[model samples]
Target: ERPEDFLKDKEKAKEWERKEAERIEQKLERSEKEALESYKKDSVEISKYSQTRNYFYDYQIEANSREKEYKELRNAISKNKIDKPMYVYYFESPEKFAFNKVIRTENQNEISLEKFNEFKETIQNKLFKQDGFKDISLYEPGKGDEKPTPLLMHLKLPRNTGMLPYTNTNNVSTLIEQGYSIKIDKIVRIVIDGKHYIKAEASVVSSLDFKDDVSKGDSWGKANYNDWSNKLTPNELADVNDYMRGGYTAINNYLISNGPVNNPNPELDSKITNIENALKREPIPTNLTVYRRSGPQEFGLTLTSPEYDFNKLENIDAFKSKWEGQALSYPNFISTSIGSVNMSAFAKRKIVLRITIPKGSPGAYLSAIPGYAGEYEVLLNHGSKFKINKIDSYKDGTITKLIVDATLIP
Candidate 1:
């Protein structure tokens, strides 16, 4: 019996150490199994989720709810027989790239690849039927003197519904009563080359540059940020007011045509007048420019300049060969008949043409006239494809509303 108590304590310590080591090993094994299971589960879930998200984002099928909405809208429009052309706001995504040739019929409205070929054929045939051309060269770009410019067409809008003759009102209080609601569906602020065209349905506003360049050094050492913000003294505010109110009175006289009483508050009127007079000017011509898309629909025009000169072009067949696959921009013109001195000018505005198919089927097509020019010489059907005749005119003091019957493809 040599040191019996010491031997007992050492044996107990060894047993405790062995148990602790086993416990740690078991725990680590369990944790590794759990982690592997968790990773497998997460991998399956993420893969499914990604597929679902991509499906919804790209290939948008006609959902039941969307189909119902479209049906209801079509029925309502057909019943209304709107009389005048209404601007339809719509969006086109990547899949339906050729949305313009959608055919509309009583039974069906969906589009198919075969139907698209039919549309292309129709356009080609129409172009072929046209006559009297030194050459009907298709538009090409960068090869000759030709440049590709898309022709822009106006969305047909009826009287009282078109974007013209901006609403006028006496005051904010009376605007609603006078049918001039203080609401706008959209506000387009087009800034081209630093010049801005701020058009608001209810009102317009703009700020000019290069005016009153106050130096940072002059206003330095004023105070802390809070003190500077809150300490806009009466004199400082007055100076700003005067600068903004420059030539406000005279401008309003031309804008409203009546005195301040007929218009809104003088101060408000002044701000609008100052902005318009300073900023409202025609945009500069640029061959390479981005078209601003607005309204309730989509349209596109693609044009190419011919590789060869117009004079050197051999025949209409050669021209048609070049034109077959090329895109073209239609030219536009505006006229003002002031005291028999009719002034006309032309611009390069691209056109977007679209045709709609029927509800469930892919038959029938609706074609739209591009735009109205002062004069157009058609090479098709002896220039009887379209005609423009004047209609009734209504005089509203300073504004004149005119109606015209535009026949496309008689």
Candidate 2:
């Protein structure tokens, strides 16, 4: 809600301008939310801890698509490495989210498997999936997770925007009275659903009795391919885009190309040749890590060593130990994804490479160009070297997972 931190740093602000232009360019797409009948279906009998959440939308939308649009807000929070209280404003009437904790208070056999899994996922998945929801807590339905839960809303004195003539109530204002500070994690966006009325994934926060199971993982629960740590902050990301976005046409080509110098794609092959030469005649970089996944053979002969380590994560300990603490390099042009979603599905034996780059390294930052998996993607010049520090494994649901924590050998 309040924007001042990066603006005060002149260089940061300058860096932001480029990203800001990208955002505005996308915004120029002239976009897009709403509440649905699901609210009408929630049972009225509620727990004292269960309060109402609200929504105000003009054109009808679903809980799912609306949730998708908000990832922008969540990813931004992650990229910015932000955890400030936002004076989130909402214009809405209320919706009920009444839960039967009493049922969970009883035994597991009391409910059917379908019903039980529903209850389990609601709490378990909510830790990461509900990035924009307000109040959150865990109900260990036979399992507890340890991934850092991304919180979506924090209304530090959350203000209620004046009259919503259609909805007819300042929903959050009714109970909160004077808004309190809630640890917000994700986003703050206002757009039109055939019309613009600032709509939020309305929620309120209260202290929960449980603390994260710190013994298992970091402050949050497990890590998944979709989730990331060791992130580049907002300003740093801005600087990368400012550094490479203008020339991303060449970069994206290099990023997606397979064996670029092998002559399949002539233009990219030529570009690959130049990047290789530059990586040679040039100087180098410091700490930007990227991922790559490849077959065991990719590490053979005229070959490679990498992929998003977060992908194909099974037995990642095996992959990590193979090159742990060793300084390694890729012989061919390394084509990697920015996020784990792009590549981890095949069941083949592969070696995951987590390559870290130094500052001023020769490569392209292709995330701003769109159509990639997630933010924080790069295309490093061939033969870049990195020193593996530790092999980290995280998952949405399993243990044989990973991330190669490494650094460009500066």
Report the number of the highest-lDDT candidate.
Answer: 2
| Error in Å for residue 363 of model 2 | 1.1
The TM-scores, one per candidate, come to 0.14, 0.30
In model 2, the runs with Cα more than 4 Å from the true position are 1-273, 278-287, 298-318, 344-352, 365-377, 394-401
lDDT by residue for model 1 over 86-137, one digit each (tens)? 3221111211112233332323433344653454343221211100001111
Task: Report lDDT (Cα) of residue 311, candidate 2.
Answer: 54
> Scored by CA lDDT, what does every candidate get?
0.23, 0.33
Question: After superposing candidate 1, which stretches have Cα over 4 Å from the reference?
Answer: 1-101, 104-263, 285-410
Lowest summed lDDT across 10 adjacent residues in model 1 is found at: 171-180
**lDDT of candidate 2 over 174-232, digit per residue (tens):** 11122111222333322222211212233333311111112221211122111221234
lDDT of 2: 0.33
